[PDB]
Amino acid sequence: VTASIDLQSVSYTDLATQLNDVSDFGKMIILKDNGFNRQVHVSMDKRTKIQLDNENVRLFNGRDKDSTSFILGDEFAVLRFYRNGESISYIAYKEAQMMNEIAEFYAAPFKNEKEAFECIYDKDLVSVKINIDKAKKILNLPECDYIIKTAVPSEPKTVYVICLRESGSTVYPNEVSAQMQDAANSVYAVHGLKRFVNLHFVLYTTEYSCPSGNADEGLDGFTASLKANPKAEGYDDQIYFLIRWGTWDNNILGISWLDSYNVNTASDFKASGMSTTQLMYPGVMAHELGHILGARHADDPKDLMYSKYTGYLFHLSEENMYRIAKNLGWEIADGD
Ligand SMILES: [Zn+2]
């Protein structure tokens, strides 16, 4: 029988044993719920590396039509999929205590609610289901937005995306990892860019914190803190994000230096930005990374790079895709 995940009882060990069984050639898995059945073909993401404080996190994806992705670390696992345009995450932490902390963290803003947030049991809490689209309606959270600032190689070039937990912030591994995954997926979906770049995300803590709620001033201080950091000398040519759970003033979800990374000339920590990592705004880091790689605001409301927050995870503008791919060392002759 085809392997299956029962969404009425999915636990960390369910997801871990299914995903640890995914070989280089992929594996069919059926997602099952009441009135719901989706067969997905899962493959390991061999292009993206993630360490969160040296903890290794692996990524998996269904086919494009499957609208399904997974995250797996030693401490947590995520299944996220889209149904009727809504992003549904099943979040499962291995240790009971942390799973309870996570459930209480997600339950707190809500104190039809089960359609937005539900603890999943097998008695014993095994995961939480969050429908962020229903959750934002119930919590009447604002639209939010952005507004930001100014030859196929033999092997893909490794580019580190160094993510720095803002001092005094608390972020959760499932939430940070989801942002990194959508950011990585958003780049690889463009012009076969896996042939050109392999993104390596790391998360550390920084002493820096924004002195105000102004995202512009915060980014100025962040980029300056990188230049003044001895640990970072010699790494001025990588990509940097300051991350927090929350947003900035004026419902600003993130900010970055526009068109500031190019594989030939990257330097001086110019390729820096800031991003929220909270679950209800997927794709913010993807959006800011697109800006860093040269993407500008697109007109299509279904584009990741639309000026307001849309919830879409993929570049649609041919012009942006060109600019991003060019900055990563591709050219039109290379095709897709
Ligand atoms: Zn923007």
Contacts for 229 with CB less than 8 Å, ≥ 6 apart: none
Q: How much distance in Å is there from the Cα of 237 to the middle of ligand 1?
A: 22
Contacts for 168 with CB less than 8 Å, ≥ 6 apart: 209
Residue 60 inside a domain? The answer is: yes
Catalytic residues: 288
**The residue type at 126:** V
Q: Show the domain range for 265.
A: 157-334
* φ/ψ of residue 9, rounded to 5: -150, 20
- Count how many domains the chain has: 2
Assess whether 59 and 184 both reside in one domain. no
Using alpha carbons, select from 284, 166, 289 the residue that is nearest to residue 238: 289
Assess whether 125 and 162 both reside in one domain. no
For 55, the 3-state DSSP assignment is: strand
Residue 151 inside a domain? The answer is: no
CA distance 230 to 322: 35
CA distance 29 to 191: 28
Using alpha carbons, select from 53, 94, 104 the residue that is nearest to residue 71: 94
Residues in the chain: 336
Assess whether 184 and 241 both reside in one domain. yes
Q: Which of 104, 138, 172 finishes a domain?
A: 138
One-character DSSP codes across 100-149: HHHHHHHHGGG--GGGTEEEEE---EEEEEEEHHHHHHHTT----B---B
Does an H or E element contain 274, and which? strand 272-276
Q: Are the beta carbons of 187 and 293 closer than 8 angstroms?
A: yes
CA distance 311 to 250: 18
Assess whether 210 and 322 both reside in one domain. yes
Residue 187 inside a domain? The answer is: yes
Residue 301 inside a domain? The answer is: yes
The two structure tokens encoding residue 109: 């803003």
Assess whether 79 and 165 both reside in one domain. no
Assess whether 239 and 294 both reside in one domain. yes
Q: How much distance in Å is there from the Cα of 54 to the middle of ligand 1?
A: 30
CA atoms within 13 A on the CB side of 275: 36
For 272, the 3-state DSSP assignment is: strand
Please state whether beta strands 239-244 and 272-276 pair in parallel, antiparallel, or not at all (unpaired). parallel
Residue 240's DSSP bridge partners are 162, 272
One-character DSSP codes across 64-102: GGGTEEEEEESSEEEEEEEETTEEEEEEEESSHHHHHHH
CA distance 34 to 6: 9
Residue 150 inside a domain? The answer is: no
Q: 64 burial class (0-12, 13-18, 19+ CB within 10 angstroms)?
A: exposed
Contacts for 103 with CB less than 8 Å, ≥ 6 apart: 119, 125, 128
CA distance 120 to 129: 7
* φ/ψ of residue 300, rounded to 5: -65, 120
Residue 160's DSSP bridge partners are 200
CA distance 160 to 224: 19
Method by which this entry was solved: X-ray
CA distances to 110, 202, 280 from 317, in Å: 37, 29, 24
Q: Are the beta carbons of 115 and 97 closer than 8 angstroms?
A: no
For 195, the 3-state DSSP assignment is: helix
* φ/ψ of residue 290, rounded to 5: -55, -45
Tell me, what CATH number does 113's domain have?
A: 2.40.128.470
Tokens 């692996």 correspond to: 58
Tell me, what CATH number does 313's domain have?
A: 3.40.390.10
Assess whether 184 and 94 both reside in one domain. no
Assess whether 61 and 167 both reside in one domain. no
Assess whether 177 and 123 both reside in one domain. no
Query: What is the chain's percent helix, strand, coil content, to nearest 5?
Result: 30, 30, 40
Assess whether 48 and 108 both reside in one domain. yes
CA distance 200 to 161: 6
Q: How much distance in Å is there from the Cα of 26 to the middle of ligand 1?
A: 35
Residue 149 inside a domain? The answer is: no
Q: How much distance in Å is there from the Cα of 250 to the middle of ligand 1?
A: 14
The two structure tokens encoding residue 324: 């991003």
Resolution of the structure, angstroms = 2.0
Contacts for 132 with CB less than 8 Å, ≥ 6 apart: 86, 87, 89, 279, 280, 282
CA atoms within 13 A on the CB side of 195: 15
Give me the helix-helix angle, 284-292 and 173-188, nearest 10°: 40
Q: How much distance in Å is there from the Cα of 106 to the middle of ligand 1?
A: 27
Residue 118 inside a domain? The answer is: yes
Assess whether 105 and 180 both reside in one domain. no
Residue 71 inside a domain? The answer is: yes
CA atoms within 13 A on the CB side of 212: 9
Q: How much distance in Å is there from the Cα of 318 to the middle of ligand 1?
A: 17
Q: Which of 138, 165, 198 finishes a domain?
A: 138
* φ/ψ of residue 17, rounded to 5: -70, -35
Using alpha carbons, select from 187, 181, 199 the residue that is nearest to residue 89: 181
Q: How much distance in Å is there from the Cα of 131 to the middle of ligand 1?
A: 24
How far, in whole angstroms, is CA 235 from its chain's centroid? Answer: 23
Using alpha carbons, select from 327, 177, 336 the residue that is nearest to residue 263: 327
Q: How much distance in Å is there from the Cα of 118 to the middle of ligand 1?
A: 32
Q: How many CB atoms lie within 10 A of CB 198?
A: 18
Assess whether 123 and 165 both reside in one domain. no
Q: Which of 75, 107, 138 finishes a domain?
A: 138
